[PDB]
RNA sequence: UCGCACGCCCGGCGGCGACGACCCAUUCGAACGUCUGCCCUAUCAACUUUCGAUGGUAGUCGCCGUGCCUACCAUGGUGACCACGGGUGACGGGGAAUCAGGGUUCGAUUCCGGAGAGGGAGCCUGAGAAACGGCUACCACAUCCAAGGAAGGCAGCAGGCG
RNA sequence: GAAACUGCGAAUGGCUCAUUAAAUCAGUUAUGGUUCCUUUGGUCGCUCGUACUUGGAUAACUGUGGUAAUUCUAGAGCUAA
């Protein structure tokens, strides 16, 4: 599951190749456009709150 | 046809345009305007096929959009503008003024006039309307809806319009003795005095017109255009002066003319 | 829809009896006297004659 | 879709005409408005020629005219009491053209008491302490008291109307088409028409 | 008498509830020299589709037929007759058309078999497009 | 709102055009109507009718008129003058062929009007479409695929198969 | 001046004759029973109660992508009528 994370206050965006389901259970089964704590995908990320803005399915 | 039609075939064109059978599939479709589809003459037909100032429609476009021709005292830039009856098409560089009247036959004629005559033209009133504050409105045949007219001018008369102000000067009441042009039907182009008015309630009324040489003929009101008080017009009349001499008289007058010219 | 005429007309006509001996001899005399190449160029002149004559008959009935 | 066709139905003789074309758009039908009484809700519909129509769906007020004395007021509608078309349009409270409604008589009472200064309605024994009817009825000058005296000989009303004014609500008939135009305009029933429809409502009650 | 329908049967233009202290009837002339009848003025009927006392204009064609059936209410059936010319045979055929026309209740006593003038109007029903404009009696039949 | 020239009072008045819009005429129309007109068949003589058929009333809808639709009433409407039903190797017409006078057959086809885009149906936008070189389905046919999906309509010009 | 937004056209033209037998269609009339983009001509201080110009989106552009695949499109930034 590729994750396209964008930050608008600097306006910089990056794709990150997360492939860990224990990292992704925090984003799983939540509805679009909610703010989520992002400390699960990395210990380096902490205090980052992130809106889930909808992606592309495995058939695009 | 799921909407308005935009073409016209060369064969289905009205015949008094005199368009040739062979050079085109299409005839120029007249744009919507102050004259009907079959009653008008397109400006491409007036330049290209008759005056021969142009050769093709591209040259017609070039003439019309160098802003030269000035029809009814205003320049129109579209190729297929409808120029109808009694319209003043003026060309400024040649200094040449044209007034559109039918000749003795059904077709329109190249009719050169003076600028002093080109400053005005004449219009048949179609309907009198009363507008939104008791305002008398007069509607002509070319949709010139001038308002506050003279209250003697009524439904089937004609008026004289100064084009620069776009306003009435004088008028002719529809009455017996006045000259009239027949602007439609089988009598298309005749000139004579109105000798009789036959009323018909419900259906359309007819008028007997006696020409310059005695030959009377009847025509319904919608095809009749009065052109001046009494026995004299207010415009200059074309060659032939609206008679329709017979085919025998046409034959021997061209035969005697060719015999006398040699 | 194309821009062309399609107005045409046969100028000759074929006779009803094909082998009438006196008609053959008369036509052969005419084309031999006037130097003609077939009989369609006597049939067309007889047909133009026929059209002029029926126009004359129709005017005489008027 | 839903259509208005002469081609879909039988001839004068009873024979069946077979269709030669599809359902064209210009032979159009639309679902009905079925305008009810409630807080107002009007939908616009795009029309042939790029026009628009205003379908009422709920409609509380309407502009009703009192024709004998020439006063129309915006007036709230309370009930539909009669319909010559159908009784279910009475039952399910439905505003159409020529349906007969009840509307409250208070603006007409205000105009009448402003114009003539006489009590209309007013079951005698009750008297309004907030003094607005008192300053309506009183305080005329000597020059204009004979003007009001000249008016109050033309101030007599029909007894059926006076019963409806004491009831506080009067009968109107709608004349605008509320599914078409949007409004619920109509006029107060008077005279022969009034007692005709009162006879009809009394026959409906029984 | 009148008021036999569900709604109030009234002429729309005249207002009948002006205050006092009989009813004024609306009528007109339809033109074309057709003289409006006496019962259309002294009448007590109302009619939406009467040519004289209703919102219809007589316009276009003026025809004449023969009354055959008067069973429909406020409207009757006339029978037009004409000779149709085939061009092969130099003869005629008798054909006929049965149209339904609207008979106003101003023309009171009409029997079957009398020539009736009708006039074209707006389409009044599915098959009615003509009003009755004047009635003449049959051959004799004055009894 | 937009563009050309650019001035005159003593900052304010200004020329010629473009674009846009309530309503009214006008134009190109359109759509419903009026009257009259069409091939064969009786081994098709009665048909239509509360499942609208014919009207009346009052409405709904529609741009408008109208059974167009709804409610309540009336029992009507057409037919031997051929209705109704069926057939058509039937688009209609201007016209074409043959022809003394009569007629007879043809008219798919360059002009006018209609209908239709495989079959039916439904609809967005727009002044105007029930549009198909526009969508939405269902039926038939059929293209690509990783099997999850996507895309189609030559009765347009060429061309291919049958 | 590419692109893109906006306006207009795309309902004309071209093809075919399957349907359809008072239907289509022809002549004749009516719309006083209606709609009409455009064109042309009218009207556009008529009302009596920040204007020295108001608001915030969005495409083209930039930059991350997804899908076996389409004139498929998502998220992030800007910016006009
Ligand atoms: Mg077409
Ligand atoms: Mg014969
Ligand atoms: Mg067939
Ligand atoms: Mg066929
Ligand atoms: Mg044909
Ligand atoms: Mg065929
Ligand atoms: Mg179609
Ligand atoms: Mg095919
Ligand atoms: Mg197409
Ligand atoms: Mg389609
Ligand atoms: Mg195609």
CA–CA gap between residue B169 and residue B108 (Å, rounded): 26
* CB distance E116 to E75 below 8 Å: no
CA–CA gap between residue E2 and residue E23 (Å, rounded): 14
CA–CA gap between residue E1 and residue D203 (Å, rounded): 19
**Residue D173: burial class (beta carbons within 10 Å; 0-12, 13-18, 19+):** buried
* CB distance B137 to B154 below 8 Å: no
| Resolution of the structure, angstroms | 3.3
List residues bridging with D58 in a β-sheet: D36, D41
In Å, how far is E60's CA from the nearest CA of chain D? 22
Give, as one character, the DSSP assignment of residue B25.
S
- Phi-psi category of residue B244: left, alpha or beta, with phi > 0 → left and psi -120 to 50 → alpha: left
Tokens representing B145 are 């809806």
Q: C-alpha angle B67/B72/B78, rounded to 5°?
A: 45
* CB distance D41 to D27 below 8 Å: no
Mutual angle of helices C40-61 and C21-33, in 10-degree steps? 100
Considering only CA atoms, which of B37, B23, B15 is closest in space to residue B108? Answer: B15
CB burial readout B43-66, b (16+ within 10 A) else e: bbbbbbbebebbeeeeebeebbee
Judge if D100 and D173 occupy the same domain.
Answer: yes
Three-state DSSP at A42 gives: coil
Residues of E in contact with D66 (CB under 8 A): none
Range 56-95, chain E: CB under 7 Å to any strand F atom: 60-61, 63, 69, 71-75, 77, 80-82, 84, 87-88, 93-95
Range 109-138, chain B: CB under 7 Å to any strand F atom: 126-127, 129
* CB distance D134 to D119 below 8 Å: no
User: Can you give the three-state secondary structure of chain E, one letter per residue?
Assistant: CCCCCCCCCCCCCCCCCCCCCCCCCCCCCCECCECCCCCCCCCCCCCCCCCCCCCCCCCCCEEEEEEEECCCCCEEEEEEEEEEECCCCCCEEEEEEEEEEECCCCCCCCCCCCEEEEEECCCCCCCEEEEEEEECCCCCCCC
Provide the residue ranges of all domains of chain B, joining segments of one domain with +: 1-116, 121-171, 174-244
Determine the distance separating the centroid of ligand 6 and the alpha carbon of B192, expressed in angstroms: 56
User: Can you give the three-state secondary structure of D92-144, one letter per residue?
Assistant: CCECCCCEEEEEECHHHHHHHHHHCCCCCCCCECECCCCCHHHHHHCCCCHHH
- Residue D179's nearest nucleotide, by CA–C1', is F60
Q: After which residues is chain D broken (C to N over 2.5 A)?
A: none
Contact E19 D68 (CB under 8 A): yes
Consecutive H or E run containing D74: strand D71-83
Hey, how many other C-beta atoms are within 10 angstroms of the C-beta on D148?
16
Determine the distance separating the centroid of ligand 7 and the alpha carbon of B80, expressed in angstroms: 30
Residue B219 has phi, psi (to 5 degrees) of -155, 140
Task: From residue D156, give the alpha-carbon distance in Å to each of A24, B183, D144.
Answer: 86, 66, 20
Hey, how many other C-beta atoms are within 10 angstroms of the C-beta on E102?
24
Tokens representing B4 are 């308005």
Considering only CA atoms, which of E42, E26, E58 is closest in space to residue E106? Answer: E42
Question: Which domain covers residue D100, as residue numbers?
Answer: 31-105+169-206
* CB distance C43 to C13 below 8 Å: yes
Structural domain count, chain D: 3
Tokens representing B25 are 């599939």
Judge if D156 and D120 occupy the same domain.
Answer: yes
Experimental method: cryo-EM
Determine the distance separating the centroid of ligand 3 and the alpha carbon of D20, expressed in angstroms: 14
CA–CA gap between residue A5 and residue A8 (Å, rounded): 10
Percent of chain B that is helix, strand, coil (3-state, to 5) = 15, 30, 55
Residues of E in contact with B199 (CB under 8 A): none
* CB distance E121 to E130 below 8 Å: yes
Judge if D52 and D151 occupy the same domain.
Answer: no
Overall residue count recorded for chain D in this entry: 206
- The CATH code of domain E1-142 reads 2.40.50.1000
List residues bridging with B90 in a β-sheet: B70, B97
CA–CA gap between residue D183 and residue D175 (Å, rounded): 10
Contact B202 E33 (CB under 8 A): no
β-bridge pairing D186-188 and D61-66: parallel
Nearest to D68 among E7, E8, E18 (CB): E18
Judge if D20 and D77 occupy the same domain.
Answer: no
Task: From residue B3, give the alpha-carbon distance in Å to each of B6, D22.
Answer: 9, 17
Considering only CA atoms, which of D94, D55, D47 is closest in space to residue D180? Answer: D55
Consecutive H or E run containing B109: none
CA–CA gap between residue D115 and residue D152 (Å, rounded): 9
Q: C-alpha angle E28/E33/E36, rounded to 5°?
A: 35
């Amino acid at each position: 599951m590729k994750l396209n994370i964008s930050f608008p206050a600097t306006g910089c965006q990056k794709l990150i190749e997360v492939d860990d389901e224990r990292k992704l259970r925090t984003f799983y089964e939540k509805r679009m456009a909610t703010e989520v704590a992002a400390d699960a995908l990395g210990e380096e990320w902490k205090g980052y709150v992130v809106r889930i803005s909808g992606g592309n399915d495995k058939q695009g | 046809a799921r909407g308005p039609k935009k073409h016209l075939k060369r064969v289905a064109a009205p015949k008094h345009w005199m368009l040739d059978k062979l050079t085109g599939v299409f005839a120029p479709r007249p744009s919507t305007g102050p004259h009907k589809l079959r009653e008008c003459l397109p400006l491409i037909i007036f330049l290209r096929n008759r005056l021969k100032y142009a050769l093709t429609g591209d040259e017609v476009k070039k003439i019309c959009m160098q802003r030269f021709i000035k029809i009814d005292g205003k320049v129109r830039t579209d190729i297929t503008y409808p120029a109808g009856f009694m319209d003043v098409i003026s060309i400024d560089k040649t200094g040449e003024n044209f007034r559109l009247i039918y000749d003795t036959k059904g077709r329109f004629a190249v009719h050169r006039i003076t600028p002093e005559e080109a400053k005005y033209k004449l219009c048949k009133v179609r309907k009198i309307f009363v507008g939104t504050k008791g305002i008398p409105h007069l509607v002509t045949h070319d949709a010139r809806t001038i308002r506050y007219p003279d209250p003697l001018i009524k439904v089937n008369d004609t008026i004289q319009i100064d084009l620069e102000t776009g306003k009435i000067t004088d008028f002719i009441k529809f009455d017996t003795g006045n000259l009239c042009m027949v602007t439609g039907g089988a009598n298309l182009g005749r000139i004579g005095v109105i000798t009789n008015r036959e009323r018909h309630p419900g259906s359309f009324d007819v008028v007997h017109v006696k020409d310059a040489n005695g030959n009377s003929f009847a025509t319904r009101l919608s095809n009749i255009f009065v052109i001046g008080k009494g026995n004299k017009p207010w415009i200059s009349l074309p060659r032939g002066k609206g008679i329709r001499l017979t085919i025998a008289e046409e034959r021997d007058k061209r035969l005697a003319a060719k015999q006398s010219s040699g | 829809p194309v821009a062309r005429s399609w107005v045409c007309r046969k100028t000759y006509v074929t006779p009803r009896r094909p082998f009438e001996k006196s008609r053959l001899d008369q036509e052969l005399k005419l084309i031999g006297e006037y130097g003609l190449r077939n009989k369609r160029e006597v049939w067309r002149v007889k047909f133009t004659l026929a059209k002029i004559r029926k126009a004359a008959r129709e005017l005489l009935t008027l | 879709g839903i259509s208005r066709d002469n081609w879909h139905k039988r001839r004068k003789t009873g024979g069946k005409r077979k269709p030669y074309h599809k359902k064209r758009k210009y032979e159009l039908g639309r679902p009905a408005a079925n305008t009810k009484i409630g807080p107002r809700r009007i939908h616009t519909v795009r029309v042939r020629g790029g026009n628009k129509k205003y379908r009422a769906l709920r409609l509380d007020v309407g502009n009703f005219s009192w024709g004998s004395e020439c006063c129309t007021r915006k007036t709230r509608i309370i009930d539909v009491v009669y319909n010559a078309s159908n009784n279910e349009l009475v039952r399910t409270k439905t505003l159409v053209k020529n349906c007969i409604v009840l509307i409250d008589s208070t603006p007409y009472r205000q105009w009448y008491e402003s114009h003539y200064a006489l009590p209309l309605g007013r079951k005698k024994g009750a008297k309004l302490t907030p003094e607005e009817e008192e300053i309506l009825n009183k305080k005329r000058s000597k020059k204009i008291q004979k003007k009001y005296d000249e008016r109050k000989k033309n101030a007599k009303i029909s007894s059926l109307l006076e019963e409806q004014f004491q009831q506080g609500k009067l009968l109107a008939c709608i004349a605008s088409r509320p599914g078409q135009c949007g409004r619920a305009d109509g006029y107060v029933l008077e005279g022969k028409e009034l007692e005709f429809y009162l006879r009809k409502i009394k026959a409906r009650k029984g | 008498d009148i008021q036999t329908e569900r709604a109030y049967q009234k002429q729309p233009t005249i207002f009948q509830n002006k205050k006092r202290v009989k009813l004024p009837r609306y009528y007109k002339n339809i033109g074309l020299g057709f003289k409006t009848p006496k019962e259309a003025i002294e009448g007590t009927y109302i009619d939406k589709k009467c040519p004289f006392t209703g919102n219809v204009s007589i316009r276009g064609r003026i025809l004449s037929g023969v009354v055959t059936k008067m069973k429909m209410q406020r409207t009757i059936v006339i029978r037009r007759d004409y000779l149709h010319y085939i061009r092969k045979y130099n003869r005629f055929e008798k054909r006929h058309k049965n149209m339904s026309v609207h008979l106003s209740p101003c023309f009171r006593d009409v029997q079957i078999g009398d020539i009736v003038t009708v006039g074209e109007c707006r389409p009044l029903s599915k098959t009615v497009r003509f009003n009755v404009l004047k009635v003449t009696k049959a051959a004799g039949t004055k009894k």
